[PDB]
């Protein structure tokens, strides 16, 4: 019944009968996807480290998660509101999330939750052409990547060279099978952090989020210039 | 077929209880955390509270580190462990129901029609191999 705060405001731990992680609301009153709602007068949505990917990195421990309540963030890979809902909760009504996806089959529910939250603005174009949404927004404070395409480093390199201000954050979730199967996660993740520090991304940390996902990692970095 | 329906809906009850019970727990992370540094002395040193900031309480469990109550001694701990045991016994009930419905379904599949033979393995686990003949 007791809510304690996290390292990043907008992220909390609801301790008590179930010591489980939680974010705020920017949706007044309702859940979006049947996540549990805790009230402590004030409404809270439970994040899940299995249903979502950034929550697994938080549960594994990300110190300088550049998603933070005074910014605006660019989300390249949600496909649906199940993570960008919590990112709009943690960034609050001060900022804005640009949830950019390509496959317009779950873009319907993406736009449907972007109706409810003005924090979330959608882009329904593929993230390897950022020039097609040049004229929509620029200069984000942190990019997020959840694309499971083979050219992850090139896609987020193009998006960060067009839309990320200097010394900002990069969080990239890397699935090992979408790049190279049959070889282990350690070599493919070392290969991808070297591929990403080929660009102006100083790698800060990687972690493997093993109880939540098989053969994944979350890599954070700071955009040099 | 109706007692197979009974066992199948019992299995689906335990399946849904399993998934929406494990949705409302929190599991301790176990991930190979890696930190990238400069030349060699930053690697030689202790990573001096770069994200721990206490080496006693907020270093070695990572579900929430920090930057600076109804019997919290054992009551909440036993309640936590007992809810974990509830999910584990939901899992045991679900796998036993899956096995018994699988044997029931094999028996029902066996008594339909077609030609078949009793195939015996090394152990004694019998199976029934059906003749290659399509259905008229």
């Amino acid at each position: 019944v007791v809510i304690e705060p996290h390292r990043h405001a907008g992220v909390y731990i609801a301790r008590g009968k179930e010591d489980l992680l939680v974010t705020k609301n920017m949706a007044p009153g309702e859940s979006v996807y049947g996540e549990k709602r805790i009230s402590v007068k004030v409404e809270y949505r439970v994040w899940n480290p299995f249903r979502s990917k950034l929550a697994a990195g938080i549960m594994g421990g990300l110190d300088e998660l550049f998603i933070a309540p005074g910014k605006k963030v660019l989300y390249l890979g949600a496909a649906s509101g199940t993570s960008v809902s919590h990112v709009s909760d943690v960034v609050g009504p001060e900022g804005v999330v640009y949830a950019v996806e390509f496959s317009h089959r779950p873009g319907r529910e993406l736009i449907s939750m972007a109706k409810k939250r003005p924090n979330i603005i959608p882009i329904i174009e593929d993230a390897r052409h950022p020039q097609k949404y040049r004229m929509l927004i620029g200069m984000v404070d942190c990019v997020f990547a959840d694309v499971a395409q083979p050219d992850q480093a090139r896609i987020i390199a193009l998006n960060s060279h067009m839309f990320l201000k200097d010394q900002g954050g990069v969080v990239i979730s890397i699935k090992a099978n979408c790049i190279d199967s049959t070889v282990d996660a350690e070599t493919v993740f070392a290969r991808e952090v070297q591929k990403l520090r080929e660009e102006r991304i100083k790698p800060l940390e990687q972690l493997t989020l093993e109880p939540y996902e098989r053969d994944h990692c979350i890599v954070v970095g700071r955009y040099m210039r | 077929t109706q007692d197979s329906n009974y066992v199948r809906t019992l299995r689906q009850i335990e399946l849904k209880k399993l998934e929406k019970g494990a949705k409302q727990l929190m599991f301790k992370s176990s991930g190979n955390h890696t930190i990238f540094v400069d030349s060699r002395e930053k690697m030689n040193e202790f990573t001096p509270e770069k994200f721990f900031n206490t080496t006693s309480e907020m270093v070695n469990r990572s579900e929430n580190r920090l930057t600076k109550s109804i019997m919290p001694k054992e009551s909440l701990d036993k309640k936590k462990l007992k809810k974990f045991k509830q999910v584990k016994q939901h899992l045991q009930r679900e796998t036993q129901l899956k096995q018994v419905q699988q044997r029931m379904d094999a028996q029902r599949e066996l008594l339909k029609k077609g030609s078949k033979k009793k195939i015996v393995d090394s152990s004694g686990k019998i199976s029934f191999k059906w003749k290659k003949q399509r259905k008229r």
Binding site: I13 | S56, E57, M58, L66, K68, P72, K80, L81
Partner: peptide, 27 residues
């Protein structure tokens, strides 16, 4: 720094002891 570091250690212990385990962790 005594009144800051001692109170920070006391608040950190009074938080972190109320979500932890010693013999229940392996269980």
């Amino acid at each position: 720094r005594k009144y800051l570091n001692k109170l920070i250690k006391r608040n950190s212990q009074n938080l972190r002891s109320w979500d932890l385990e010693e013999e229940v962790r392996d269980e």
